[model samples]
Target chain A: MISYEFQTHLPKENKELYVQATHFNNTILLQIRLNGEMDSTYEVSSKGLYDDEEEEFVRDHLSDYQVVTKLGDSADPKVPVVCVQIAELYRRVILPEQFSLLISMSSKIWSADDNDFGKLVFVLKCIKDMYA
Target chain B: MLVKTISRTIESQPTLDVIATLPADDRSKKIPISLVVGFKQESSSLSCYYYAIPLMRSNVVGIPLLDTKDDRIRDMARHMATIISERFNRPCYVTWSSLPSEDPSMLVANHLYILKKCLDLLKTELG
Candidate 1:
C-alpha cells in the first residue's frame, strides 16, 4: 500500500488548497495545489489601473516565486512572469505571510518523523490559519 | 456535453498536447475561436513541439504550428481552457502529477508537461 496524505479543504474563503503526498523508494513527494483570486491585478499595467512603480515593485517581488506553466512536456511556452495580488493585501502583507507559512510548514514537515501523516495534517492546519 | 467531449479527446491522445478553444464573445471576436496542438516526448523533459490552428466552430483555420517554452505558456493555455469550458458549460481538463524533483526548474517543467497534455486533450476535443 502506498502511504499518502492529502487535504482538500481550505480555511480561507475564495481560496482552495490541495496538498497531496506519496512516497517512492524512500523518497517522499509532496504536491501542493493552490488556487485563489488575486487581491489586485498585478498583471494589469495601464493608466489609472495601477501605478507603474507599484506594478514594477510587485513584479520584481513576485519574481522570486516560480509557477508552473506546462505539464508533462519538456519544453513549455513562455508567458509573462507575474504574481498574484490579493485585494486589500499589499506586498507587505502577502510577502511575509505567504513565505512565512510556507517556510514554517516545510520546516516542520521536513523534520517530522518519516511517513507521519500527522505532520501533514498539522501543515494543513497551519495553512488554514495562515490564509484564513 | 463539451466537457465530456473534451475529456474524451484528451484520453485518446498518446502524447503530450495542448489545445485551446475560444468562444465567440466580445473577447474572442478579434481573437476568433481557435485550437492549438502540440506533441512531447514521454521520457524527455527538455522540450516540446506544438502548433496552433484557428477554427470556426468545426472548420480549421489556416495557421502555423508554434513552439514555446513549457512554463508560463501552460498557465495561459489552462486559463483559456478554463474560461472557454466555463463559458460553454464544458469541462476543462488539467492534469497534475507528483513533483519529479526538488530542483525548481525540473519541478516547473514537469508541471508544464502535465498541464500541456491535459489542455491539448481538451482543446483537441473542442476543436
Candidate 2:
C-alpha cells in the first residue's frame, strides 16, 4: 500500500513548548480535533473515513507523504485518494493534564476506518484554519 | 439513595468488575451506554477503566484511553473531565489502570501521523 507514516519527536526544550506547525492545515486540524476530544473524549479518525483509497495510494505511491501539496495523482482526479501532510509540533506536554487530552483525541482518531473519513477530514480542516 | 447506572461499555474483565462493585444505593438512575477506548495491543498493555460517580447523581461511566501524546490533548482531557463532571453534577474519576501510567511515546508518533492527514483537509477548506 502507498501508506506513508512520518513521525517527529518534540522533546520539550523550552517553556514555550515550541509548537512549529509546518503546514497550516495540520495546526488547525490538531486544535479542532483536540477540542472535539475535550468535548467528547474521543479523537476523530481520518484513515477510517478514507481507508480504501489511502491504502491503495500507499500501495502505489510508497512516498505519498513526501508529495506535500496533494495526495495521489491529482492529474487523475478519479483515483480517489487521501493526502497526509506531516509536521512536528514541539512542546513540553505535562503529564496527566496534557496527557489526558492527547489520549482522548488519539483514541477517537485511531479507532476510525474508511467509514469516518469525511467527518475526520472536515474536522481536521476546521482546526487548520482557525487556530492562532 | 438509589445509585443510577448510565452507560457501561468497558469490555475487559477487570474493568467490568471495578464498575459492577459500585455501591448500589449510590445511583439515582442507570442506563447502559457504549464507551470504547482504542489501544493497539501491539503498543500498550493497559485497556479501559470503569468508575461510578455517587456524589454526581450515580452516573456510572466508563472511560477508555486513546493512545495519544500531544500536549494540546491534555487541555482537551481536562476540558472533558470538567464538562462531564459538571453535566453529572458530582465528582467523577477514571478508574482504568492506564489513567495513572505513562503512555508509550510511540503511540503519540502514530497518532500524530494520523492527525497530519486530518490537517490537510482542514487547510483545503480554509482556502
Candidate 3:
C-alpha cells in the first residue's frame, strides 16, 4: 500500500494532543483529533453552492489535491461523484482513496501534562516504516 | 463510437524542443475537439483559462473538421467549454493562497489544481 507521512501545526499551545483513527470500512478510515484543541470536523456529501466555512483553512490549503483519476471508468462524473470529509482542527481533508491508512498524530507542547512523547515518537517511526 | 479524452498536467514552459521531439502517433488522430489551457498569474491571483473547439471532418491528423460546419454546434461547444473552465478555476486562487512559503506547498497546490482541472474537463466533455 502506498502511504505518505506529513506534519500539521497547531495554533494553540497544548501539552498533549489526542488523536484517533476510526475505521469506517475495509478501505476507508477517519483520522481525527477530538480535543478542545482542534475545531469541529466538516464534511460535504453533496454538491452545492453553500460552502462549508468551518473548514475554510483546510479547503484553501489542500484544494489542489484530487480525489479522482484523470482517466478510466472512475472518471465518470455521473458515477463517481466528488465529495469531501475534512477534520476541522487538523485541517486535513481525507480523500476516499486514503481509506486504508487510518492515521493521525497528536502532539502536546514539550514538558506539559502527562504527554506521551514516547508514543508520539513511536507513531512517527511507525509511519516512516509504513511509508518507507 | 468510443471517444476517450486524456489530459496530463503540464508543469513547465512549453519548449519547442520538447514539442519537436514528441511522437506524432501519441496525439489523437482527431483534433483536440476542444481545449482549455491556463497559466497561473500571481499578481492577478487567477488561472487564466481559454478554450478552442477544433473544427474537423473525419478523424484525421491535423485536418480541420470540414464537414461539420454547423455554426450551432461550434457555438454550443465553445460556450460549454468556457463555462466548464471558469467553474473549475474557482479553487485555483483559494488553493494557491492557502499555503505558507515554508515548502513546495505552493507548487503542490498548483499541481493539484492542474490535475483536478484536467480531470474535471475530460469527465465533463466525455460525459
Best by DockQ: 2
Tell me the TM-score of each prediction against the true structure.
Answer: 0.22, 0.21, 0.18
Q: Model 3 — TM-score against the truth? A: 0.18
Local accuracy of candidate 1 as per-residue lDDT tens digits, B12-97:
32343332332323322222222333333341121211222234343322211122345554444444445444443432222222
Better of 2 and 3 by lDDT: 3
lDDT tens digits, residues B1-127, model 3? 1112133334453200000000112223221222323332221111111132223422111211111243333333233343433432211101111111123333334444544554454544444
Residue B25, candidate 2: how far off, in angstroms? 32
Query: What is the lDDT, from 0 to 100, of the residue B90 in candidate 2?
Result: 38
DockQ, all models: 0.02, 0.04, 0.01
DockQ comparison, 2 vs 3, better candidate: 2
Docking model 1 quality class: incorrect
lDDT of 2: 0.26
Point out the higher-scoring one by TM-score: 1 or 3. Answer: 1
* Deviating ranges (above 4 Å) for candidate 1: A1-7, A12-16, A19-132, B1-14, B17-127
- The best-first sequence of candidates by lDDT reads 1, 3, 2
Top candidate by lDDT: 1
| Worst lDDT 10-window in candidate 2 chain A | A16-25
